[model samples]
Target: GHHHHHHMDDIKVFQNEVLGTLQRGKEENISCDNLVLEINSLKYAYNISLKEVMQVLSHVVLEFPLQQMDSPLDSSRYCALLLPLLKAWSPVFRNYIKRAADHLEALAAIEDFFLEHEALGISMAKVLMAFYQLEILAGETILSWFSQRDDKGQQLRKNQQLQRFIQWLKEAEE
Candidate 1:
């Protein structure tokens, strides 16, 4: 019987599909902008239908839950909107740095709304937490990926661009 030892490249392709964006960025890496655009587009297209589901959460307002925090809305409508949003955006937890930086300018635009509003501040805090945590995760992931090298096991992080991105992620955490 002939034995086929398949190449490392083949194994990498398998890793990319199974692990998705969490991989080492073999040849193609998902950029921060692309991640932001994907989530936003999802929200825009499915928000109406999703809102109907979240609307049910509003009934539990007695629990002091904020629904509108999920979506950009008033405090009175917090539960229904906010609850669903949290669930919807939960998938982006692994890619936090890209997600937050995606709308850096946009977030600043609504600063006044957040400050003057009551429940909205809670939502803002949640976003800040996500962004910070994402940055932390991304830094760790990138570093781990760099430590592993080519078939010979070289130090991949030695590359200037890779070093810079990792450094940026680390510095931003401060």
Candidate 2:
């Protein structure tokens, strides 16, 4: 047998399938209850790990308009709505930022989420607080992500609202 591997191997199916459910829910203006159940069913059928789920979810959420946080489109609500999926799978996500890519993309998805809404006076730090309260993201995980030397990591936390929250992560870790 001949075989090779690439990054997309694990999540490609989830990437496509989850996007379909999410977009269909968006188009139909359906309740989050339906979308969540359908998406959760995909998890059972696909046997997706918690980390894999977040990665696919973050990537799928990013497929919407980056500016929708402030626009009339409101599609990002699907992203926010489906986040309860994290609650059902919380322990896996305290481990979220531990991934170099999987968790980073979630951060990027959230960053883009608030970036658009910042013009409307939304604070990224508040959302980070929500993640912390939700138990999906730990103070240590936030610190770990910010501690990375890469500018991409640094760039994500550069929001004025995040300044104090970054300090809180630091203090919490120490």
Candidate 3:
């Protein structure tokens, strides 16, 4: 047992497998059900740490493209693809969220994504509540970003629209 294990393939193999499966499903446009068991089943085989899993998940939920939107201005396309992807990766995501450093990375991606897409009418405020509901992100996490001193944080804070969401978060804290 002192010799070779295929351990070299762990992160590489696991990341490729998960990314590949997601790519396949995206072509067919499968829903949460199609991915839940399929993704969860793979969870057992990959014993990677949650942060590593977050790294994998960031590739999917943050980067995977969705099918064409019925309307370019529609936010539904994002929510549809991403919210479920978040759920399918829940075991990893919730654990990832438990650590602020992991979450800060993800939230930064989310912030940049919104900065780019909001011009096309995808509101960060709208999807944020959904993320909270689905446990993909907590209200505190969303609130936490508001207190960030970084450029992106300051920029997002300037969005009057997101400020409205911040108000709601303060009330809801909701």
Candidate 4:
């Protein structure tokens, strides 16, 4: 066995097969909003600023320098997960939460999601609680940016918001 394998066309095939199935189902009157949303709702439904958050999240995981065999998580296992969470959470924040304050509402919704999953027992409940915490972290990160005040604060609000987002993504200390 080799230490690395990056022939990702097979992975694309898997994504396409699943996506195509979802699309076909939509054609057949199924209400599923595609596969990514389905899986994201199960777990890993945090906010991200990608247009196709599902695809972007998948690309992020797959394109990681996978040559190291001791990487933290299995690329395949995560790739299997990225799509569904993307499909579910992408819309709530991306489509529905148009304003910054809406994040609070999103938090409420996510908590409700966790409660629904909690019946699976303590382990699953803990996982869901952790997911909620991550979303809270994301909101805190966003609010920190918007809360900044300077001479150009009002004039640069949007720019500042974008800057904070990039900072949150890049700063390793977080």
Candidate 5:
């Protein structure tokens, strides 16, 4: 419990530092090149995945009004700006999303119409929705991302759980 509390504090400190960097970027009208460099350093310093980095950005963006962001750019615009760099930096993260989207192992864990694998499903849905909200992925893109296998590992779309997963992603909030 002590270690867990310490970890949580570390996350808070990292998040606070990230928010301040973003605010300064906005105020100084930071160039995309510089922003990318700063973000890269933050990513390295926090030792977090790109998705986790995006989650931090999403959390910070949700703090202020869109108008408070730089003109011709909302906070979400910064998120969108980061996409190409991120994609270039790591193809594996993109594949990770695809893998998570298509994973059906949790489907077997359901019990009488209830989700025993609820946490797994929810986390996947949240990640996918985070990408979509960041404007890096479109709805149709997601449709293609998960249109790989059926319940029996067949190509046909017979997996009810996968369908449910996609639906859940659609309903996820920022």
Candidate 6:
């Protein structure tokens, strides 16, 4: 019971630190890279896994008031800023989705955000590349989706990054 209490306390402390970091970033102009570094440090300090860190970050982004900004770029900026961290956490996201298909909704939200606001295909391609590069199972899942639907390929044809990723996956198999 004592150990469980300590673990709960640790989680609470970690959550507070994450919230504080997000609050500070909201109040000031800070680079996403810097924010990623700081938050990653916090993750390391707390011995948290990447999935846990990404979940915390996803929660924070969901709650953040970026929607209040009149400019769409303001919102895109925030989401784009998260790309690096998201890229790093891509495997975790894929794993989560594999476990729970409903998690695809969350993934879709992210894909739609980047697609509508910025480099959507590239963002998704980067995640796919990471999965393939690491030889993770998620890459197979991604390939299967694209393989199943010709329209999906047609739709993403404009995304050269994804095309290249697909080509690489093919070559990597050979």
Scored by lDDT, the top model is: 3
Summing lDDT over every window of 10 consecutive residues in candidate 5, give the lowest-scoring window. 105-114
Worst 10 residues of 2 by lDDT: 1-10
Model 6's C-alpha root-mean-square deviation from the true structure amounts to: 9.4
Segments in model 1 whose C-alpha atoms lie over 4 Å from true places? 1-84, 90-101, 134-172
Pairs of colliding residues, candidate 5: none
Summarize candidate 3's per-residue lDDT along 57-91 as a digit string, tens digits. Answer: 66556555544354454566666666666665555
lDDT of 1 by residue, 125-161 (tens): 3433343353422434434444443322232234344
TM-score for candidate 4: 0.27
Greater lDDT among 1 and 2 belongs to 2
- RMSD of candidate 2 to the truth, in angstroms, is 6.7
Residues 1-174, model 5: lDDT tens digits = 987787577667777877677667667766656655776687777666565555455444333333344564433454454444334323322332343332222121111111222322323344344555644455665665465433322422334555676776666522
Q: What is the TM-score of each predicted model, taking all chains together?
A: 0.25, 0.50, 0.61, 0.27, 0.42, 0.40
Residue by residue across 1-174, what tens digits does model 6's lDDT show?
997787677666776787778677666745566677777788888867665665555555533434344453453455455444444444433443444333433444444444455533455566555444543334445555455433344566457777777777776565
Model 4: lDDT of residue 149: 49
Q: How well does candidate 5 score on lDDT at residue 144?
A: 51
Pairs that clash in candidate 1: 54-80, 66-78, 67-78, 67-79, 67-82, 68-78, 68-79, 68-82, 70-82
lDDT of each residue in 4-111, candidate 2, tens digit only: 234355367767898788667567755556666776788777767766677666556544434244555453463475454445434434443454465565675666
Candidate 5 residues lying further than 4 Å off, grouped into runs, are 66-135, 141-174
Global lDDT of each model?
0.37, 0.59, 0.64, 0.38, 0.47, 0.55
lDDT of 4 by residue, 13-106 (tens): 4444544444444356444344445434422333223333334333332232232234454544433453344344343334434454555444
Off by over 4 Å in 4: 1-92, 119-137, 141-174
Residue-pair clashes per prediction, in order, are 9, 0, 0, 9, 0, 0
> 1 or 4: which has the higher lDDT?
4
Runs of candidate 3 with Cα error greater than 4 angstroms are 1-17, 24-52, 67-76, 87-92, 116-121
lDDT of 1 at 89: 37
